[PDB]
């Protein structure tokens, strides 16, 4: 488990999505450095133009790369499930707008940590903030959260993503999350805590495809030494 993440680990991300009938795919690659809670990745829309704003996909696109401080090591479900991995499912409710429902498998394939996602989005307003592409190309800092789901041998998470809108308003995206291990080996069931997140989004000047460059840092907290 934790031994798999002591160094830098390559990452592959694949997402197949359908939002209001608009089909798209995203492929990402990069690396994770859990020792420093750090993610560096570049994503490409491989089907042409992305029909939703890139920021709305960030949370979907490997929380095993969070930095858990030493006194919180016994609360790191995500690494304890590795290499066999876990299923990660979410409902993401965009306030006054549509919903994403996602199901992913996060696991090692060889030496690579792979996140393979299916996304279905429904009920979005065209000319709303998502289909109308009115969200700023940036990202905020959040608190993710985590509670134990002792019945399903897993965890749940809840959190509210804040997407800044071009007109200065905020588009809220309520996240409900469940994770369950793929194997039957023992996993860590944590006490209540949170992940403290932060991210920046940028563009590669030499990249002509629709894309997103992402840098992210995540540290667990909420349990005192």
Swiss-Prot record:
Outcome of mutating residue 97 to E: In mut1.27; shifts fluorescence lifetime from 3.03 to 2.85 ns
Transmembrane segments: none
Reported effect, residue 187 to A: In mut1.5; shifts fluorescence lifetime from 3.03 to 2.72 ns
Tissue-level expression: Photocytes.
Use of this protein: Green fluorescent protein has been engineered to produce a vast number of variously colored mutants, fusion proteins, and biosensors. Further generation of mutants led to more stable proteins (at 37 degrees Celsius for example) with brighter fluorescence and longer fluorescence lifetimes.
Outcome reported for the amino acid change (mutating residue 140 to I): In ECFP; leads to cyan fluorescence, folds faster and more efficiently at 37 degrees Celsius and has superior solubility and brightness
Record annotation: effect of changing residue 143 to K: Increases fluorescence at warmer temperatures such as 37 degrees Celsius. In Esmerald; leads to brighter fluorescence. In VisGreen; leads to brighter fluorescence
Known role: Energy-transfer acceptor. Its role is to transduce the blue chemiluminescence of the protein aequorin into green fluorescent light by energy transfer. Fluoresces in vivo upon receiving energy from the Ca(2+)-activated photoprotein aequorin.
UniProt xrefs under Gene3D superfamilies: Green fluorescent protein
Effect of residue 63 to M: In Citrinine; leads to excitation and emission peaks of 516 and 529 nm, respectively
Organism: Aequorea victoria
Outcome of mutating residue 66 to A: Increases fluorescence at warmer temperatures such as 37 degrees Celsius. In GFPmut 3; highly fluorescent mutant when excited at 488 nm
Effect the entry attributes to changing residue 170 to A: In mut2.1; shifts fluorescence lifetime from 3.03 to 2.50 ns
Gene name of the record: GFP
One Pfam family recorded for the sequence: GFP
GO terms for biological process, alphabetical: bioluminescence; generation of precursor metabolites and energy
Protein name, per record: Green fluorescent protein
């Amino acid at each position: 488990g934790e031994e798999l993440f002591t160094g830098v680990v390559p990452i592959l991300v694949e997402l197949d999505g359908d939002v209001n009938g608009h089909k798209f795919s995203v492929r990402g690659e990069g690396e994770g450095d859990a020792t420093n809670g750090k993610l560096t990745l570049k994503f490409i829309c491989t089907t042409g133009k992305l029909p939703v704003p890139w920021p709305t996909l960030v949370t979907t696109l490997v929380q095993c790369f969070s930095r858990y401080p030493d006194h919180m090591k016994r609360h790191d479900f995500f690494k304890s499930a590795m290499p066999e991995g876990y299923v990660q499912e979410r409902t993401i409710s965009f306030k006054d707008d549509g919903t994403y429902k996602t199901r992913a498998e996060v696991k090692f394939e060889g030496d690579t940590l792979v996140n393979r996602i299916e996304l279905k989005g429904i009920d979005f307003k065209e000319d709303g903030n998502i289909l109308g592409h009115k969200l700023e190309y940036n990202f905020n800092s959040h608190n993710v959260x985590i509670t134990a789901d002792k019945q399903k041998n897993g965890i749940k998470a809840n959190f509210k993503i804040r997407h800044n809108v071009e007109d200065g308003s905020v588009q809220l995206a309520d996240h409900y999350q469940q994770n369950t291990p793929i194997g039957d080996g023992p996993v860590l069931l944590p006490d209540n805590h949170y992940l403290s997140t932060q991210s920046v989004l940028s563009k590669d000047p030499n990249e002509k495809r629709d894309h997103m460059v992402l840098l992210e840092f995540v540290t667990a907290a909420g349990i005192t030494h």
